[PDB]
Amino acid sequence: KFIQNAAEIAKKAMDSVDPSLSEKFTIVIRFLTDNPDAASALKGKERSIVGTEEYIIASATNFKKGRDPRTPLPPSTIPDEMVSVILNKYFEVPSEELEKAEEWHRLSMGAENIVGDLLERYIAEVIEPHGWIWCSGSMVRAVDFIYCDSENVWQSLQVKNRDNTENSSSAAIRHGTPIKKWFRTFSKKRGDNWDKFPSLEGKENLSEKGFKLYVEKYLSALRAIKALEHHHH
Amino acid sequence: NAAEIAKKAMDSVDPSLSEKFTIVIRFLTDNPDAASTEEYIIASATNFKKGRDPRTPLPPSTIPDEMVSVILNKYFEVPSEELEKAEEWHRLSMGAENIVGDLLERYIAEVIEPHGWIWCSGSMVRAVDFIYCDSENVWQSLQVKNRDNTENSSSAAIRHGTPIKKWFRTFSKKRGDNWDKFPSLEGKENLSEKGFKLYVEKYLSALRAIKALEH
Ligand SMILES: [Ca+2]
Ligand SMILES: [Ca+2]
């Protein structure tokens, strides 16, 4: 459970980190004070116990960190040479393109491991104007977005990229409606699931085209950023 | 009489494995936490035999995420016309990855089973992949992994015997192989990264020839 002056801790913590996030973050802390089973230990920073002042202050940096752009990263795992032997000797992938196949495999795994994060970013850009809050970083378990609605009731939303997405999670809601759960894509079949995205202000904006346009924009911007890194060295 | 029940069950399924399967049932009778009544042993006999069937490399059945092609195109600059090719080679690489661990066991099985070790085929044995009853009747057990960080790992307690000799072929973070540290046992000398490559190429050559005659 949370300390006696949780909100005032949150405010000043995020004022040092990023003043534009302070209001939103303060509300996240209030949400976790009312709903403590959604509170999670911070990944990489587990030294601070869930609910203490030290956790609130560490959560502020974490919450902001979560919103910095991620670069699509192929894993640093050196590939198995026997994978290439199988591509060449069974699947008849030409021997001179084996190195290429190896790299695109790694890029494809890098693409896969950031799509979940970009989905949250897309959704956040659309629904944060209307008062919803993307719970960025790892301080919140199970819930990806929160909203204190016009009736002062906590709404909460979980998104997955796929229906068979690995990290399933649930947390108990002491005060609020049940967590709305939604997945973008099907593992069983082609197509998307935006039609059944839970009702909330701004919902009509959200779609697969919208998400595709967000991703083109985010990667274009990011490419341009890394171009400026080489000019600044 | 679990040994006699194990004998009969495997005589029904495949008599060529009845000797090896019985010794594995003896191993799980002494070390029941490695086990993954009479009906269990009948079921196991099929599982163990199934694990010895030649397995084809199969790309996953799964439907690709359309956004992966977009990220390949728009971040990593893979051309429009090559995206489908990239998608398919990714699927093929996963199917290759999904079988290398199996090919590794079969290779080791070919070498060390003639020296009285037994391949724990199928998934009836948790963690442990090979076993042996040494000259003084003690259970030596061996657990093989393709990579040091290989995605999933399942584990068991040794009740009676020496600890589980653990070993992996390749490293996640650096190039090369780890065959130099393979556990001491009869036939260790014939196991290498080159022996394995040759075994895989001959294995896949034979599969391709079978697939040619079928269609
Ligand atoms: Ca989730
Ligand atoms: Ca989350």
Author numbering:
A (entry chain A): 4 to 236
B (entry chain B): 8 to 43, 55 to 233
Quote the study on this structure.
As most other enzymes with such properties, AvaII is a Type II restriction endonuclease predicted to belong to the PD-(D/E)XK superfamily. The core of the AvaII protomer adopts the same conformation in all three structures, and consists of the characteristic αββββ motif of the PD-(D/E)XK endonucleases.
AvaII was prepared for crystallization in the presence of 5 mM Ca2+ ions. An ‘open’ conformation of the AvaII dimer is observed in the absence of nucleic acids and in complex with the RNA/DNA heteroduplex. In this form, the AvaII central channel is too wide for base-specific interactions with the bound oligoduplex and the enzyme only contacts the phosphodiester backbone. In the absence of nucleic acids a second protein dimer fills in the space between the protomers that should be occupied by the DNA double helix. The two open forms (in the absence of nucleic acids and in the scanning complex with the RNA/DNA duplex) are almost identical and no dynamic motions are found between them according to the DynDom server.
